[PDB]
Design a protein around this nucleic acid. Sequence first.
DNA 1: GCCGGTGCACCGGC
DNA 2: GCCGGTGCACCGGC
Lengths: 249, 246
Amino acid sequence: SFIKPIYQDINSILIGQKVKRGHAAGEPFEKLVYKFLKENLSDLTFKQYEYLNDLFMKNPAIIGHEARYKLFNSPTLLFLLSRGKAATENWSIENLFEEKQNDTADILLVKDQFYELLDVKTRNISKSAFAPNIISAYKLAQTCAKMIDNKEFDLFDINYLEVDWELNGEDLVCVSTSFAELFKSEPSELYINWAAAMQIQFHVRDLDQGFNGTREEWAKSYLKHFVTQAEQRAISMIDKFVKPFKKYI
Amino acid sequence: SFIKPIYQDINSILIGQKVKRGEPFEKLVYKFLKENLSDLTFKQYEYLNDLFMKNPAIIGHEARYKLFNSPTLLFLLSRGKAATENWSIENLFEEKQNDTADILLVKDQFYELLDVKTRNISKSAFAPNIISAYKLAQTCAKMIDNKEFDLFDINYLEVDWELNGEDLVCVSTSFAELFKSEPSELYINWAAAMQIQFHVRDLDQGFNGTREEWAKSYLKHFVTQAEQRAISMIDKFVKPFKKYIL
DNA sequence: GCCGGTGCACCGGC
DNA sequence: GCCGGTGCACCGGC
Ligand SMILES: [Ca+2]
Ligand SMILES: [Ca+2]
Ligand code: NA
């Protein structure tokens, strides 16, 4: 992690910060995070969309999607970070990618052909804990599937940054942060909430970090968990959404 | 319905309406209604606030809940046990992401729940989440259990807008009623928080049959659809990944 | 045309 | 403590 070694810097400058008072979060702190990481690690840090523009700017020779897709040099990273075929082809120097809500990552750090996908989960601390959607389980499955096919086991990490806040009035105030790597958690202990867009849910400060095996072992362990859980859900649908209503019909 | 009678008016006013750089067209819809039907028009939180101030004696959740005198409307409209419990005049209800409705219109003990759908028509059509299919099945169930078949309607107002400048402008609107649609035609997208999806303008409004019949039809449709999904998952999320784990 | 997966967190039952 | 359903709509493959 390019971040972990400065968690303390990060945490020191956030606690406070004070932002000013639908499907937006409630916290602009993510912006505050980026600003910092961009500030201090300026060579390594980008919004997902910014990284793609820069990727494309640096290769004007390459027009059209199939070719701009070869600019990733990685089926798995292609999968996580790229926009659709049409948008990529229409990519133009004077027509750049903007923020898409659907983008896999919030911030993204890259040094030496290795990627840290960083997702910030903000969280109102005054309220009753509700584990937020972390990332599609189904996306992660394909992601894992893709690592194994392409033996890309030493390419990227997907990490999370929890920033907690409350309302002293007028302004929101950050009161604490947490940082966790996903590929250091025990895969079989990941909560897949199917109904909630098939998302993994957890709080970052609650997240297991004692996986000891290899990345590859992680990916295979995750697929086993995923497949196990999909079978659970299917079975669980009958008693949950079928049995209780048959009386009426 | 309460707004259909003057829907044309609502439609002519909304077009041309501009909002600065489109979820807040919902506000305009609300302003217009409050101004044209002020005694009928409430935000969900507003209606609950108005009910509970009228009965300042009736404190606590159990007692407040009895205030609805309808197990169905209790279900679509109320807040949690602690929430109602800690309700105060100095601590009133506020907006809540997953409250059922955007706007409530009511008169003579009859309820029209109105969910406004904003749509960026600039961008290629993506059928929006309408309501939870599961919350709908429960609704139908209770509708049946307590024989509440003439109490409330769940209607939608599509508000189409585009990025016409430094801000957004409404270009058109549509108005459909859930209970007029064909139950077995409704698209349940299970992954998407199990949400029924559609474009108001695309919804059929021809259902021949009583409200009770609708509820039963939907329940047939839901139960059925659930079963299909059970199996769809093994093909989608189990078969395609078994290779990596043998 | 047809189809359905994803980002944002977020509440309340027992 | 455990657990999981709900609202916002919103793209891109073929
Ligand atoms: Ca985020
Ligand atoms: Ca709405
Ligand atoms: Na809705």
